[PDB]
Amino acid sequence: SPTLTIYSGRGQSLVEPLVKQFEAETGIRVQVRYSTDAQILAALQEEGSRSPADLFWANTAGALGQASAKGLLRPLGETLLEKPIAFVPASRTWVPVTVRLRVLAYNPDRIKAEELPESLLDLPRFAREKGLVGRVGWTPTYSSFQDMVAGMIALYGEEKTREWLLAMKALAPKAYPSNPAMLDAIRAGEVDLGSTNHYYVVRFRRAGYRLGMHHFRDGDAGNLALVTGAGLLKTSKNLAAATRFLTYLLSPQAQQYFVGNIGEYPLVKGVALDPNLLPLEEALAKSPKLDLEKLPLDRALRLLRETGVL
Ligand SMILES: [Fe+3]
8 A cells, every 4th residue: 555656747658668567577566647747846836745746757857946946856866866877967856867859840741841940939930931820839738848948038038938939829829738649730731840859750750650850050949958857755755666766767678668669868878779860969969058957947837828828
Protein backbone atom coordinates (compact mmCIF):
# COMPACT_ATOMS: atom_id res chain seq x y z
CA SER A 1 0.00 0.00 0.00
CA PRO A 2 2.87 2.49 0.60
CA THR A 3 3.32 3.24 -3.08
CA LEU A 4 5.72 5.43 -5.07
CA THR A 5 3.46 8.12 -6.51
CA ILE A 6 4.33 10.19 -9.55
CA TYR A 7 2.63 13.33 -10.82
CA SER A 8 3.64 13.32 -14.48
CA GLY A 9 3.34 16.19 -16.94
CA ARG A 10 4.60 13.77 -19.59
CA GLY A 11 2.15 11.98 -21.86
CA GLN A 12 0.89 8.59 -20.75
CA SER A 13 1.12 6.84 -24.12
CA LEU A 14 4.70 8.05 -24.47
CA VAL A 15 6.10 7.05 -21.07
CA GLU A 16 3.87 4.37 -19.52
CA PRO A 17 5.86 1.51 -21.12
CA LEU A 18 8.89 2.87 -19.30
CA VAL A 19 7.03 2.95 -16.00
CA LYS A 20 5.85 -0.62 -16.61
CA GLN A 21 9.40 -1.74 -17.31
CA PHE A 22 10.58 -0.09 -14.09
CA GLU A 23 7.92 -1.84 -11.98
CA ALA A 24 8.70 -5.16 -13.64
CA GLU A 25 12.40 -4.87 -12.99
CA THR A 26 12.67 -3.35 -9.53
CA GLY A 27 9.45 -4.71 -8.07
CA ILE A 28 8.64 -1.22 -6.84
CA ARG A 29 4.99 -0.51 -7.55
CA VAL A 30 4.32 2.82 -9.19
CA GLN A 31 1.14 4.83 -9.34
CA VAL A 32 1.23 7.64 -11.89
CA ARG A 33 -1.15 10.58 -12.16
CA TYR A 34 -1.05 11.97 -15.69
CA SER A 35 -1.72 15.69 -15.98
CA THR A 36 -0.10 18.83 -17.33
CA ASP A 37 2.79 20.64 -15.71
CA ALA A 38 0.44 23.60 -15.00
CA GLN A 39 -2.34 21.57 -13.36
CA ILE A 40 0.31 19.68 -11.39
CA LEU A 41 1.77 22.92 -10.05
CA ALA A 42 -1.75 24.05 -9.15
CA ALA A 43 -2.49 20.74 -7.39
CA LEU A 44 0.69 20.91 -5.26
CA GLN A 45 -0.13 24.44 -4.00
CA GLU A 46 -3.66 23.34 -3.18
CA GLU A 47 -2.63 20.06 -1.52
CA GLY A 48 0.22 21.56 0.50
CA SER A 49 1.57 19.12 3.08
CA ARG A 50 -1.30 16.71 2.38
CA SER A 51 0.12 15.91 -1.07
CA PRO A 52 0.48 12.20 -1.91
CA ALA A 53 3.04 12.84 -4.67
CA ASP A 54 6.64 11.75 -4.30
CA LEU A 55 7.94 12.91 -7.68
CA PHE A 56 7.07 15.58 -10.19
CA TRP A 57 8.09 14.27 -13.61
CA ALA A 58 7.79 17.48 -15.66
CA ASN A 59 7.42 17.89 -19.42
CA THR A 60 9.39 21.19 -19.21
CA ALA A 61 12.13 22.74 -17.09
CA GLY A 62 10.12 25.94 -16.51
CA ALA A 63 7.65 23.94 -14.45
CA LEU A 64 10.46 22.54 -12.26
CA GLY A 65 11.81 26.07 -11.90
CA GLN A 66 8.39 27.11 -10.60
CA ALA A 67 8.20 24.20 -8.16
CA SER A 68 11.69 24.96 -6.95
CA ALA A 69 10.95 28.69 -6.54
CA LYS A 70 7.87 27.69 -4.54
CA GLY A 71 10.18 25.63 -2.31
CA LEU A 72 8.49 22.34 -3.24
CA LEU A 73 11.60 20.31 -4.17
CA ARG A 74 14.43 18.57 -2.29
CA PRO A 75 18.13 19.07 -2.98
CA LEU A 76 19.68 16.30 -5.09
CA GLY A 77 23.08 14.62 -4.68
CA GLU A 78 26.20 14.83 -6.84
CA THR A 79 25.90 11.23 -8.02
CA LEU A 80 22.58 11.90 -9.66
CA LEU A 81 23.52 15.35 -10.98
CA GLU A 82 26.86 14.27 -12.50
CA LYS A 83 25.24 12.04 -15.12
CA PRO A 84 23.47 14.55 -17.38
CA ILE A 85 25.83 16.13 -19.96
CA ALA A 86 24.16 19.53 -19.59
CA PHE A 87 21.20 21.50 -18.25
CA VAL A 88 21.63 20.74 -14.57
CA PRO A 89 19.87 23.51 -12.66
CA ALA A 90 22.00 25.78 -10.47
CA SER A 91 19.38 25.24 -7.77
CA ARG A 92 20.24 21.52 -8.01
CA THR A 93 16.65 20.65 -7.01
CA TRP A 94 15.79 18.54 -10.06
CA VAL A 95 17.47 16.44 -12.77
CA PRO A 96 17.19 16.93 -16.55
CA VAL A 97 16.39 13.73 -18.46
CA THR A 98 15.89 14.46 -22.14
CA VAL A 99 16.23 17.47 -24.37
CA ARG A 100 13.88 18.45 -27.20
CA LEU A 101 13.92 21.24 -29.79
CA ARG A 102 11.06 23.56 -30.70
CA VAL A 103 10.59 23.54 -34.48
CA LEU A 104 8.10 24.66 -37.10
CA ALA A 105 6.21 21.82 -38.75
CA TYR A 106 4.67 22.46 -42.13
CA ASN A 107 3.02 20.94 -45.17
CA PRO A 108 5.62 21.14 -47.98
CA ASP A 109 2.90 20.82 -50.62
CA ARG A 110 1.41 24.05 -49.30
CA ILE A 111 4.43 26.02 -48.15
CA LYS A 112 7.87 26.38 -49.69
CA ALA A 113 10.79 26.11 -47.27
CA GLU A 114 12.53 29.20 -48.73
CA GLU A 115 9.62 31.52 -47.99
CA LEU A 116 9.24 30.67 -44.28
CA PRO A 117 10.39 33.47 -41.92
CA GLU A 118 13.75 33.45 -40.14
CA SER A 119 12.06 34.41 -36.87
CA LEU A 120 8.99 33.20 -35.00
CA LEU A 121 8.12 36.86 -34.31
CA ASP A 122 7.54 37.25 -38.07
CA LEU A 123 5.13 34.32 -38.29
CA PRO A 124 1.89 36.35 -38.11
CA ARG A 125 3.21 38.69 -40.82
CA PHE A 126 4.09 35.75 -43.02
CA ALA A 127 0.74 34.07 -42.34
CA ARG A 128 -1.13 37.26 -43.21
CA GLU A 129 0.79 37.62 -46.46
CA LYS A 130 0.07 34.06 -47.59
CA GLY A 131 -3.61 34.29 -46.65
CA LEU A 132 -3.35 31.60 -43.96
CA VAL A 133 -6.33 32.71 -41.87
CA GLY A 134 -7.60 29.69 -39.94
CA ARG A 135 -4.69 27.64 -41.33
CA VAL A 136 -2.16 28.03 -38.55
CA GLY A 137 -2.14 25.51 -35.72
CA TRP A 138 -0.97 25.82 -32.14
CA THR A 139 -1.12 23.93 -28.83
CA PRO A 140 -1.91 26.36 -25.99
CA THR A 141 -2.32 23.66 -23.30
CA TYR A 142 0.99 21.94 -24.16
CA SER A 143 3.72 22.84 -21.65
CA SER A 144 6.59 23.02 -24.18
CA PHE A 145 4.63 25.65 -26.08
CA GLN A 146 4.08 27.52 -22.81
CA ASP A 147 7.83 27.36 -22.11
CA MET A 148 8.54 28.65 -25.61
CA VAL A 149 6.34 31.64 -24.73
CA ALA A 150 8.13 32.12 -21.41
CA GLY A 151 11.25 32.01 -23.57
CA MET A 152 9.97 34.90 -25.66
CA ILE A 153 9.23 36.92 -22.54
CA ALA A 154 12.80 36.31 -21.41
CA LEU A 155 14.26 37.19 -24.82
CA TYR A 156 11.98 39.97 -26.11
CA GLY A 157 10.06 41.10 -23.05
CA GLU A 158 6.43 40.81 -22.02
CA GLU A 159 5.36 43.61 -24.38
CA LYS A 160 6.64 42.13 -27.66
CA THR A 161 5.44 38.66 -26.59
CA ARG A 162 1.92 39.81 -25.81
CA GLU A 163 1.80 41.51 -29.18
CA TRP A 164 3.04 38.39 -30.95
CA LEU A 165 0.33 36.41 -29.19
CA LEU A 166 -2.38 38.86 -30.18
CA ALA A 167 -1.13 38.90 -33.75
CA MET A 168 -1.30 35.07 -33.81
CA LYS A 169 -4.78 35.21 -32.33
CA ALA A 170 -5.91 37.52 -35.14
CA LEU A 171 -5.09 34.80 -37.68
CA ALA A 172 -7.87 32.69 -36.11
CA PRO A 173 -5.50 29.78 -35.42
CA LYS A 174 -6.77 26.33 -34.58
CA ALA A 175 -5.92 24.88 -31.16
CA TYR A 176 -4.95 21.22 -30.83
CA PRO A 177 -5.12 19.17 -27.60
CA SER A 178 -1.98 17.27 -28.64
CA ASN A 179 0.95 17.61 -31.02
CA PRO A 180 0.11 14.47 -32.99
CA ALA A 181 -3.39 15.87 -33.54
CA MET A 182 -1.88 19.05 -34.93
CA LEU A 183 0.50 17.12 -37.22
CA ASP A 184 -2.41 15.03 -38.51
CA ALA A 185 -4.25 18.28 -39.27
CA ILE A 186 -1.23 19.61 -41.18
CA ARG A 187 -1.02 16.50 -43.33
CA ALA A 188 -4.81 16.58 -43.79
CA GLY A 189 -4.71 20.20 -44.90
CA GLU A 190 -6.78 21.66 -42.06
CA VAL A 191 -3.81 23.86 -41.19
CA ASP A 192 -0.53 24.43 -43.01
CA LEU A 193 1.98 24.90 -40.21
CA GLY A 194 2.47 24.80 -36.45
CA SER A 195 5.13 25.06 -33.77
CA THR A 196 6.02 21.77 -32.14
CA ASN A 197 8.74 19.55 -30.60
CA HIS A 198 11.17 17.88 -33.01
CA TYR A 199 10.48 14.33 -31.83
CA TYR A 200 6.83 14.57 -32.94
CA VAL A 201 8.07 15.22 -36.48
CA VAL A 202 10.56 12.37 -36.09
CA ARG A 203 7.81 9.96 -35.02
CA PHE A 204 5.51 11.12 -37.83
CA ARG A 205 8.21 10.46 -40.40
CA ARG A 206 9.14 7.04 -39.02
CA ALA A 207 5.47 6.11 -39.52
CA GLY A 208 5.87 6.75 -43.25
CA TYR A 209 4.45 10.26 -43.36
CA ARG A 210 6.12 13.20 -45.06
CA LEU A 211 6.31 16.49 -43.22
CA GLY A 212 8.49 19.58 -43.39
CA MET A 213 10.56 20.76 -40.46
CA HIS A 214 11.74 24.34 -40.42
CA HIS A 215 14.34 25.95 -38.18
CA PHE A 216 14.47 29.67 -37.48
CA ARG A 217 17.81 31.45 -37.33
CA ASP A 218 20.26 30.37 -34.64
CA GLY A 219 19.27 31.98 -31.37
CA ASP A 220 15.64 32.53 -32.30
CA ALA A 221 12.96 31.94 -29.65
CA GLY A 222 11.23 29.53 -32.04
CA ASN A 223 14.24 27.18 -31.85
CA LEU A 224 14.19 26.89 -28.07
CA ALA A 225 15.86 23.76 -26.69
CA LEU A 226 13.91 22.43 -23.74
CA VAL A 227 14.47 19.72 -21.23
CA THR A 228 12.24 17.24 -19.40
CA GLY A 229 13.13 16.56 -15.79
CA ALA A 230 12.10 15.19 -12.46
CA GLY A 231 12.19 16.49 -8.92
CA LEU A 232 11.74 14.94 -5.50
CA LEU A 233 9.02 16.58 -3.40
CA LYS A 234 9.85 17.64 0.17
CA THR A 235 6.55 16.14 1.44
CA SER A 236 7.55 12.67 0.17
CA LYS A 237 7.81 9.71 2.56
CA ASN A 238 9.16 7.47 -0.23
CA LEU A 239 12.54 9.07 -0.65
CA ALA A 240 14.55 5.94 -1.35
CA ALA A 241 12.18 4.65 -4.03
CA ALA A 242 11.76 8.07 -5.60
CA THR A 243 15.57 8.49 -5.83
CA ARG A 244 15.74 5.04 -7.38
CA PHE A 245 13.26 6.10 -10.06
CA LEU A 246 15.27 9.26 -10.81
CA THR A 247 18.34 7.09 -11.21
CA TYR A 248 16.33 4.85 -13.50
CA LEU A 249 15.42 7.82 -15.75
CA LEU A 250 19.13 8.33 -16.46
CA SER A 251 19.77 4.62 -17.01
CA PRO A 252 20.94 3.29 -20.40
CA GLN A 253 17.67 1.46 -21.00
CA ALA A 254 15.50 4.45 -20.17
CA GLN A 255 17.73 6.77 -22.20
CA GLN A 256 17.73 4.29 -25.10
CA TYR A 257 13.93 4.20 -24.94
CA PHE A 258 13.63 8.00 -25.07
CA VAL A 259 15.70 8.13 -28.25
CA GLY A 260 14.61 4.94 -29.96
CA ASN A 261 10.92 5.05 -29.10
CA ILE A 262 10.18 8.69 -28.56
CA GLY A 263 12.77 10.29 -30.81
CA GLU A 264 14.03 12.88 -28.33
CA TYR A 265 17.66 13.60 -27.41
CA PRO A 266 19.26 11.70 -24.50
CA LEU A 267 21.20 13.51 -21.77
CA VAL A 268 23.64 10.76 -20.84
CA LYS A 269 26.79 10.53 -22.91
CA GLY A 270 27.19 7.40 -24.95
CA VAL A 271 23.62 6.59 -25.91
CA ALA A 272 23.52 6.83 -29.67
CA LEU A 273 21.08 8.25 -32.20
CA ASP A 274 20.42 6.78 -35.60
CA PRO A 275 22.65 8.41 -38.29
CA ASN A 276 19.65 9.96 -40.08
CA LEU A 277 18.60 12.21 -37.20
CA LEU A 278 19.66 15.82 -36.74
CA PRO A 279 22.62 15.48 -34.34
CA LEU A 280 22.25 16.74 -30.79
CA GLU A 281 24.94 19.40 -31.01
CA GLU A 282 23.59 20.88 -34.26
CA ALA A 283 20.18 20.93 -32.65
CA LEU A 284 21.51 22.76 -29.56
CA ALA A 285 23.45 25.28 -31.66
CA LYS A 286 20.14 26.49 -33.10
CA SER A 287 18.75 27.43 -29.69
CA PRO A 288 19.08 30.57 -27.56
CA LYS A 289 21.26 30.09 -24.46
CA LEU A 290 19.02 30.43 -21.39
CA ASP A 291 18.88 29.35 -17.76
CA LEU A 292 15.91 27.03 -18.22
CA GLU A 293 14.68 26.88 -14.64
CA LYS A 294 14.60 30.68 -14.78
CA LEU A 295 12.08 30.73 -17.65
CA PRO A 296 9.14 32.88 -16.51
CA LEU A 297 6.61 30.07 -16.92
CA ASP A 298 4.08 31.54 -14.51
CA ARG A 299 4.19 34.91 -16.28
CA ALA A 300 3.73 33.07 -19.57
CA LEU A 301 0.62 31.31 -18.28
CA ARG A 302 -0.70 34.62 -16.95
CA LEU A 303 -0.08 36.21 -20.36
CA LEU A 304 -1.73 33.32 -22.21
CA ARG A 305 -4.83 33.65 -20.05
CA GLU A 306 -4.87 37.44 -20.31
CA THR A 307 -4.84 37.29 -24.10
CA GLY A 308 -7.53 34.59 -24.21
CA VAL A 309 -5.29 31.92 -25.74
CA LEU A 310 -5.66 29.89 -22.55
FE1 LIG B 1 5.69 15.82 -25.74
